[PDB]
């Protein structure tokens, strides 16, 4: 199970 | 202030069978965009959201007739075709950024209030009347209440405002938060709305002073066809008025 | 930019026995960037329908892939992996040696 | 699915109010509350990750993931808190929120010098017909419909003349009818103060 | 023994094509269990091990949504990084992210990690305390401030110490028949004359799991580094691994050399000697 919902942009 | 989220149209009253297009411009720089709707039957609910213009979760989209696009970072569209009465709702667009969403912040537009009707012949603009202060009220309280009655309109897309000597006033005003049905028996019953404006007895008794209850009604546009006897019930303003008087 | 040339091992899944079904593997690793061409050869000719694993990478960021196909080793057929990558001025050919 | 009682809740100004939601799905991890005024968009109040207690001014949001029960408390409630309160929640697979159906809260204004009165208001241009204003009554009084589509009655509403620190309640009734006069029985509890001539 | 769950995400820009190529894979220990490829037709996260197939639709919809969102973020990042380095729009570049967690033999949290690279070099990483960041250069320092403002570490920390570790234990249990097996190495020795006066001894370990293994040559019972060679541990294709270690010896002294093999699957470390 992945991290979520999502990542910030760099 | 930089702009918030802009939605259009603010109001739409239309006949079933047509295509409706709702539009949203997110806050520039925001990279997420959400479409919600709110009704009495199902509450407040997400239809779809986008990130970097791509649809991420569309599990709330109705399975037919509804289509959402985001062709560029500045613009999204939600389309309904053919529209049906049950599509009537307030549709809200919002935008956000990752760092705001991590704090559960999103920025909402003002919404689009959509009524899709079976039949446009049920659409009526309001009749508007103003009622002048009781003389008993003036001498017992040294104050004076005007009342505005907006009656017989369908559907309920009205914005009532008070104007005193050419300028809109807020202080002293109280408008019912919701319309009442002129016959609660029927579905497409017409509506009524009241408002009050109170000022000192002194301010009413000046003959220089001029009051006006104003109602903006949202109805037909001139792309809608109309062959009835009566006047086409278009989007329009209906006002009534009174001047001050001492005796 | 930093570029890292691939390490190549060519080998069978099971101990090779002539006439017996097996898998030929070419494992490429330690490379960057990820774009790479890998063919398996039978007597100098490309084998068609070779499969590969999904691109992944190591602690040092360098990539690795396993290419493989079913084959039946014989005494006289020669097998090889051929690899091309930006770091190579020409494709590298590594012959399968059954005791490696 | 989240369960939220619709109310309406009616409380006097200055009261503590308690709102809550129940949910079923243990995957929810983020819990929020919104206020929405009539005909406007939802405004985020308070937001709680996972469990625990979170204060901001007169508001406290709380989450109990064992009982799956979340609540918002409003101290020292004010007329301007009158709104619909919605809870919303999500997991971590999506930004999609699930909302409760909302609880309507009415905070009744404290009217310090009531003067309950019922008045006839004559139309400005020419409708010898008129309306009756029931005004200046305190917020213990509640208001009800007429018995017949002959007669039209709007619920009470509160106005703020802020120039003169002064507020008052009002309700309005009308008809076109001869048999209609202000000084008649209605379907609700007021005290004995009128006026007429 | 110890265990890990790791996710790997690679995106490569392709000037002249519509979008970067994005490839994501997830592992438990050395075993692959899911993948996503932006160019493939399914547009879903897909099972790559049998034990993950039992997860239901909510699982697959969620994992596919996250990995699709992640492809979009890597796409925007490739543009941002090009702009930060003032690089031509003509070149192809790469972004990589990996994250995951380890547990010990007791299955409790040991450590979590999250790291990012641009063109194969460290860009930014979460440090072991899961509160702070190391940045490679000034571009990465601007990113670090952004992530600090947005409390990214806190949310990563919550996941790595919580969900990451729980779902790992869940997988370890639902896949126990293949993830908690040890296949002891099948072991043998090979001999070849390499010269007139020299021979190579090669000690083999085959069909073992997990990949971790140590192979050493001794001579007279003393460790031997000179004239030895160790190949990289390599996958067999069937879930197991292979490795060998060779030593070149004066011919006729073969019996002085001994190969020593240590693997979890071995109650005791093996010693082999030429025939």
């Amino acid at each position: 199970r992945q991290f979520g919902p999502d990542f910030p942009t760099i | 202030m930089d702009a918030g989220v802009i939605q259009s149209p603010r109001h739409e009253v239309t006949e079933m069978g047509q295509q409706v297009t709702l539009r949203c411009k997110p806050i520039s720089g925001h990279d997420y965009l959400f479409w919600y709707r709110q009704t009495m039957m199902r509450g407040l609910e997400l239809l779809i959201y986008f990130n970097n213009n791509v649809p991420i979760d569309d599990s709330g989209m109705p399975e037919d007739r509804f289509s959402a696009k985001m062709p560029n970072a500045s613009f999204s569209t939600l389309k309904i075709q053919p529209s049906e009465p049950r599509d009537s709702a307030v549709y809200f667009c919002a935008s956000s950024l990752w760092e705001k969403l991590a704090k559960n912040i999103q920025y909402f537009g003002a919404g689009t209030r959509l009524s899709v009707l079976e039949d446009l012949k049920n659409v009526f603009p309001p009749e508007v009347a103003v009622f002048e202060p009781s003389e008993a009220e003036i001498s017992h309280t040294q104050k004076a209440t005007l009342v505005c009655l907006a009656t017989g309109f369908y559907p309920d897309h009205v914005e009532l405002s008070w104007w005193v000597n050419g300028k809109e006033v807020h202080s002293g005003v109280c408008t019912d938060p919701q319309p009442l049905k002129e016959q609660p028996a029927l579905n497409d019953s017409r509506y009524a709305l009241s408002s009050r404006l109170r000022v000192s007895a002194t301010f009413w008794q000046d003959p220089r002073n001029h009051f006006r209850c104003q109602v903006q009604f949202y109805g037909l546009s001139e792309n809608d066809e109309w062959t009835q006897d009566r006047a086409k019930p278009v989007t329009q303003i209906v006002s009534a008025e009174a001047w001050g008087r001492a005796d | 930019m930093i570029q890292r040339t691939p390490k190549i091992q060519v080998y069978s899944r099971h101990p090779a026995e002539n006439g017996k079904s097996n898998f030929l593997n070419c494992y490429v690793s330690g490379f960057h960037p990820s774009d790479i061409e890998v063919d398996l050869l039978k007597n100098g000719e490309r084998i068609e329908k070779v499969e590969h694993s999904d691109l992944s990478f190591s602690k040092d960021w360098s990539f690795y892939l396993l290419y493989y196909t079913e084959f039946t080793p014989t005494e006289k057929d020669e097998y090889a992996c051929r690899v091309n990558h930006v770091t190579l001025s020409q494709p590298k050919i590594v012959k399968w040696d059954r005791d490696m | 699915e989240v369960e939220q009682d619709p109310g309406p809740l009616s409380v006097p100004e200055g009261a503590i109010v308690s709102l809550n939601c129940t949910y079923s799905n243990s995957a929810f991890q983020y819990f929020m509350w919104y206020r929405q005024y009539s005909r406007k968009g939802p405004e985020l109040l308070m937001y709680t990750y996972s469990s625990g207690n979170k204060e901001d001014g007169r508001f406290t949001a709380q989450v109990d993931k064992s009982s799956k029960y979340i609540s918002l408390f409003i101290r020292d409630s004010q007329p301007s808190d009158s709104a619909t309160y919605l809870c919303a929640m999500r997991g971590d697979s999506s930004y999609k929120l699930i909302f409760g159906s909302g609880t309507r809260l009415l905070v009744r204004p404290d009217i310090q010098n009531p003067d309950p009165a019922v008045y006839q208001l004559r139309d400005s241009k020419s409708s010898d017909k008129s309306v009756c204003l029931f005004t200046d009554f305190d917020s213990q009084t509640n208001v009800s419909q007429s018995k017949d589509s002959d007669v039209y009655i709007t619920d009470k509403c509160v106005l703020d003349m802020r120039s003169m620190d002064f507020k008052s309640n009002s309700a309005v009734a009308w008809s076109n009818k001869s048999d209609f006069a202000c000084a008649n029985a209605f379907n609700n509890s007021i005290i004995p103060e009128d006026t007429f001539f | 023994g110890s265990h890990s769950m790791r996710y790997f995400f690679t995106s490569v820009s392709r000037p002249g094509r519509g979008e970067p190529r994005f490839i994501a894979v997830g592992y438990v220990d050395d075993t692959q269990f899911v993948r996503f490829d932006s160019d493939a037709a399914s547009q879903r996260m897909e099972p790559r091990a049998p034990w993950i197939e039992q997860e239901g639709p909510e699982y697959w919809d969620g994992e596919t949504r996250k990995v699709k969102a992640h492809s979009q973020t890597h796409r925007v990042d490739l543009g941002t990084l090009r702009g930060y380095y003032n690089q031509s729009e003509a070149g192809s570049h790469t972004v990589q992210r990996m994250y995951g967690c380890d547990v010990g033999s007791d299955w409790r949290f040991l450590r979590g990690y999250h790291q990012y690279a641009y063109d194969g070099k460290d860009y930014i990483a979460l440090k072991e305390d899961l509160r702070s960041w190391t940045a490679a250069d000034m571009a990465a320092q601007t990113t670090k401030h952004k992530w600090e403002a947005a409390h990214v570490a806190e949310q990563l920390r919550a996941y790595l110490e919580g969900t990451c570790v729980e779902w790992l234990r869940r997988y370890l249990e639902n896949g126990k028949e293949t993830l908690q097996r040890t296949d002891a190495p099948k072991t043998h020795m090979t001999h070849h004359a390499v010269s007139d006066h020299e021979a190579t001894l090669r000690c083999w370990a085959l069909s073992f799991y997990p990949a971790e293994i140590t192979l050493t040559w001794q001579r007279d019972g003393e460790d031997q580094t000179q004239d030895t060679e160790l190949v990289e541990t390599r996958p067999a294709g069937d879930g197991t691994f292979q490795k060998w270690a060779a030593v070149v010896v004066p011919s006729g002294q073969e019996q002085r050399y001994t190969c020593h093999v240590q693997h979890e699957g071995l109650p005791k470390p093996l010693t082999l000697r030429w025939e």
Side-chain angles (χ1 to χ4, degrees):
Chain A
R1 187 177 160 173
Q2 286 160 98
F3 178 79
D6 61 9
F7 284 86
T9 44
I10 59 89
Chain B
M1 211 86 260
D2 281 1
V5 169
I6 294 147
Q7 281 181 254
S8 94
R10 287 167 283 103
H11 295 262
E12 169 103 76
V13 180
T14 194
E15 200 170 57
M16 67 183 181
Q18 313 279 309
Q19 173 184 223
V20 349
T21 300
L22 310 178
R23 315 179 193 76
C24 181
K25 175 180 173 50
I27 288 165
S28 95
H30 284 11
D31 57 357
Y32 295 81
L33 188 149
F34 300 80
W35 280 103
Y36 298 87
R37 66 158 173 196
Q38 183 171 30
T39 58
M40 274 347 98
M41 225 46 49
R42 311 131 230 167
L44 195 292
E45 67 191 6
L46 184 79
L47 296 170
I48 186 170
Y49 76 94
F50 293 87
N51 175 59
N52 294 110
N53 300 346
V54 335
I56 300 299
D57 185 339
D58 69 346
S59 55
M61 286 288 281
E63 201 139 301
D64 199 15
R65 306 178 303 97
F66 279 63
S67 172
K69 303 287 174 6
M70 187 147 186
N72 66 58
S74 286
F75 189 70
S76 179
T77 243
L78 175 68
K79 279 161 197 281
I80 301 172
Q81 204 281 326
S83 61
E84 290 169 7
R86 78 185 154 143
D87 308 330
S88 298
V90 180
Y91 289 82
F92 288 111
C93 178
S95 70
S96 204
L97 293 167
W98 194 92
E99 64 267 29
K100 293 296 191 212
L101 289 174
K103 298 194 266 92
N104 283 296
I105 292 155
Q106 58 196 130
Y107 294 75
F108 283 88
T112 290
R113 184 172 299 262
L114 175 65
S115 305
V116 181
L117 309 187
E118 282 195 46
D119 195 347
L120 301 180
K121 297 152 32 180
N122 300 145
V123 175
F124 291 89
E127 294 204 301
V128 178
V130 173
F131 299 74
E132 299 197 339
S134 153
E135 77 279 25
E137 168 179 51
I138 282 164
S139 29
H140 196 232
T141 68
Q142 283 317 303
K143 284 184 293 280
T145 309
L146 290 114
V147 166
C148 185
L149 244 51
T151 50
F153 58 89
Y154 192 88
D156 64 333
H157 282 67
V158 291
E159 286 157 349
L160 185 153
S161 63
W162 285 95
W163 292 79
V164 157
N165 304 321
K167 276 168 276 196
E168 174 164 11
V169 304
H170 297 294
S171 134
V173 173
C174 134
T175 299
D176 318 325
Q178 310 278 41
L180 95 155
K181 315 200 170 170
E182 298 190 334
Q183 8 166 95
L186 223 64
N187 291 138
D188 320 358
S189 147
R190 303 202 230 160
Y191 289 98
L193 184 71
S194 66
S195 192
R196 294 136 270 217
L197 174 64
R198 226 178 176 180
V199 294
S200 46
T202 285
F203 193 91
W204 167 250
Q205 288 161 355
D206 205 329
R208 281 147 24 182
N209 285 332
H210 150 73
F211 307 78
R212 192 177 41 96
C213 178
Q214 172 183 294
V215 186
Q216 172 78 241
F217 173 73
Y218 296 94
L220 273 43
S221 56
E222 268 203 283
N223 288 335
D224 298 310
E225 99 133 347
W226 192 259
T227 51
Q228 305 303 131
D229 57 323
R230 55 190 268 251
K232 189 178 179 173
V234 299
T235 297
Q236 63 192 92
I237 290 185
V238 185
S239 299
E241 68 176 49
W243 286 82
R245 41 168 305 122
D247 269 339
Chain C
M1 150 206 332
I2 73 91
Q3 306 200 310
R4 294 237 258 140
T5 198
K7 291 183 259 75
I8 298 161
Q9 296 196 249
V10 188
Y11 57 99
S12 55
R13 178 180 295 183
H14 303 99
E17 300 176 62
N18 290 337
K20 300 164 147 281
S21 205
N22 205 327
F23 283 80
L24 183 68
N25 289 329
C26 180
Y27 182 61
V28 290
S29 60
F31 62 99
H32 217 291
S34 61
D35 282 5
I36 194 165
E37 298 171 342
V38 181
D39 285 307
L40 300 174
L41 315 182
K42 175 173 189 184
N43 297 134
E45 313 199 55
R46 296 183 63 250
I47 297 158
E48 295 158 39
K49 318 282 215 187
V50 169
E51 278 169 296
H52 58 89
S53 61
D54 297 308
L55 188 70
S56 187
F57 57 87
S58 297
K59 154 92 248 168
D60 71 6
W61 306 109
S62 72
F63 297 103
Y64 66 84
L65 292 168
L66 175 67
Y67 287 77
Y68 58 97
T69 182
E70 190 162 314
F71 84 131
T72 289
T74 58
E75 174 184 19
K76 292 168 186 192
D77 299 325
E78 297 186 347
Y79 292 92
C81 188
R82 181 178 61 204
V83 180
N84 199 18
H85 175 88
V86 254
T87 56
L88 272 20
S89 61
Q90 76 185 273
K92 202 151 130 83
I93 291 163
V94 183
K95 264 158 246 84
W96 175 49
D97 185 326
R98 71 177 77 197
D99 189 58
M100 314 187 290
Chain D
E1 230 222 350
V2 355
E3 299 282 11
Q4 186 171 13
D5 186 277
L9 270 5
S10 177
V11 310
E13 171 168 6
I16 303 158
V17 8
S18 161
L19 298 157
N20 58 86
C21 298
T22 285
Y23 62 98
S24 280
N25 189 342
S26 77
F28 296 138
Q29 307 162 72
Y30 308 87
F31 301 93
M32 284 104 253
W33 287 89
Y34 297 82
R35 179 170 70 190
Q36 184 174 24
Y37 294 112
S38 324
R39 303 191 207 64
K40 340 225 77 142
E43 308 177 329
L44 180 72
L45 299 171
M46 297 287 281
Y47 110 89
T48 359
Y49 170 50
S50 157
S51 253
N53 277 70
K54 262 268 313 185
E55 222 196 305
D56 171 31
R58 297 161 36 235
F59 300 78
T60 302
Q62 307 190 325
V63 175
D64 181 356
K65 290 175 110 200
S66 294
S67 307
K68 295 168 160 142
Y69 182 96
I70 71 177
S71 48
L72 173 72
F73 296 85
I74 308 185
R75 282 167 294 292
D76 187 27
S77 62
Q78 309 282 315
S80 56
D81 294 323
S82 294
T84 297
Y85 290 79
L86 300 114
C87 58
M89 52 199 76
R90 60 174 180 88
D92 71 346
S93 79
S94 186
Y95 295 106
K96 171 179 193 181
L97 265 2
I98 310 294
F99 293 84
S101 279
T103 305
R104 308 176 15 198
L105 169 71
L106 189 289
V107 179
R108 302 191 309 272
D110 189 343
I111 298 291
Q112 278 152 117
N113 289 98
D115 188 10
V118 162
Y119 301 105
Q120 255 203 132
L121 296 189
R122 213 87 123 296
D123 179 307
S124 193
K125 270 224 160 193
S126 183
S127 295
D128 210 355
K129 103 173 53 44
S130 290
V131 296
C132 303
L133 179 67
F134 173 37
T135 174
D136 283 356
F137 57 89
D138 91 279
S139 300
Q140 188 109 303
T141 313
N142 291 12
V143 184
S144 45
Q145 299 318 280
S146 52
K147 282 294 95 203
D148 42 335
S149 254
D150 311 345
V151 26
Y152 294 114
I153 308 181
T154 61
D155 197 356
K156 62 190 164 161
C157 156
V158 202
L159 72 90
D160 207 330
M161 298 167 81
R162 195 136 78 270
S163 194
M164 330 174 202
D165 228 324
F166 178 97
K167 295 177 334 294
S168 64
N169 292 307
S170 296
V172 182
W174 68 100
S175 230
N176 345 307
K177 311 192 65 160
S178 294
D179 322 320
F180 195 67
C182 282
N184 55 26
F186 290 122
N187 293 123
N188 54 346
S189 200
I190 72 186
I191 40 163
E193 284 84 23
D194 185 62
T195 309
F196 143 96
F197 36 62
Chain E
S2 212
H3 298 281
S4 63
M5 184 183 226
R6 289 180 186 145
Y7 279 104
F8 300 85
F9 309 86
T10 302
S11 194
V12 187
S13 61
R14 303 189 283 196
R17 304 283 308 281
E19 264 147 26
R21 179 72 176 277
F22 168 89
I23 293 158
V25 296
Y27 281 76
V28 172
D29 300 330
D30 303 301
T31 305
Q32 200 193 335
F33 77 98
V34 286
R35 72 150 173 222
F36 181 88
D37 184 346
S38 58
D39 271 11
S42 77
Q43 295 297 304
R44 309 275 305 171
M45 186 73 98
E46 305 189 300
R48 296 293 253 154
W51 46 266
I52 199 74
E53 279 157 351
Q54 63 187 116
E55 304 295 342
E58 194 177 300
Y59 177 86
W60 292 101
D61 289 348
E63 299 299 307
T64 122
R65 188 179 317 110
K66 292 179 273 175
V67 75
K68 288 175 44 198
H70 204 149
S71 74
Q72 295 304 334
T73 267
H74 266 204
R75 177 184 53 86
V76 171
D77 288 349
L78 279 158
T80 307
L81 293 160
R82 191 208 57 72
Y84 284 173
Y85 293 100
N86 203 38
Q87 283 162 334
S88 166
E89 286 179 37
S92 175
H93 295 88
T94 307
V95 166
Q96 296 158 271
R97 173 182 270 122
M98 94 73 169
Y99 66 80
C101 52
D102 297 347
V103 298
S105 66
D106 63 355
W107 292 18
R108 303 166 74 194
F109 170 86
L110 221 57
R111 94 205 104 227
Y113 32 73
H114 173 271
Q115 300 189 263
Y116 196 108
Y118 182 55
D119 290 336
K121 305 103 186 185
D122 288 336
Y123 182 76
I124 193 169
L126 192 62
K127 308 177 145 184
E128 165 139 310
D129 69 354
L130 317 179
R131 282 151 227 288
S132 39
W133 299 96
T134 77
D137 62 13
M138 294 280 160
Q141 228 190 324
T142 76
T143 295
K144 166 170 142 71
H145 193 242
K146 176 188 179 194
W147 289 5
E148 287 180 338
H151 298 225
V152 181
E154 296 190 333
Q155 185 147 339
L156 252 358
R157 182 166 32 111
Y159 166 80
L160 296 163
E161 288 182 309
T163 296
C164 185
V165 136
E166 7 253 44
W167 275 66
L168 173 47
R169 290 188 281 262
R170 171 206 186 88
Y171 296 149
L172 257 359
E173 169 87 322
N174 298 165
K176 99 198 306 286
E177 39 178 287
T178 64
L179 295 169
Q180 300 184 224
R181 88 199 186 273
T182 50
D183 303 326
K186 310 354 171 224
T187 265
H188 70 275
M189 205 179 295
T190 254
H191 183 261
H192 311 270
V194 290
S195 93
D196 287 32
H197 80 271
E198 272 164 328
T200 290
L201 288 168
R202 181 182 291 112
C203 175
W204 283 92
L206 265 12
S207 313
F208 60 92
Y209 183 89
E212 166 126 286
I213 190 162
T214 118
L215 258 40
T216 58
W217 281 100
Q218 291 187 12
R219 173 249 261 290
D220 293 1
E222 185 57 81
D223 284 297
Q224 259 279 325
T225 211
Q226 208 183 28
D227 303 313
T228 61
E229 115 148 279
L230 255 90
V231 291
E232 186 192 343
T233 301
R234 73 184 32 174
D238 63 359
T240 75
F241 296 79
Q242 303 181 348
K243 195 186 191 67
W244 54 257
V247 66
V248 70
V249 64
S251 55
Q253 293 197 23
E254 352 272 340
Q255 343 86 292
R256 315 235 319 259
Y257 290 71
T258 201
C259 171
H260 295 270
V261 182
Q262 298 127 91
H263 180 81
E264 269 173 274
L266 294 171
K268 301 230 170 185
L270 299 163
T271 305
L272 297 80
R273 21 186 30 120
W274 171 235
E275 161 253 19

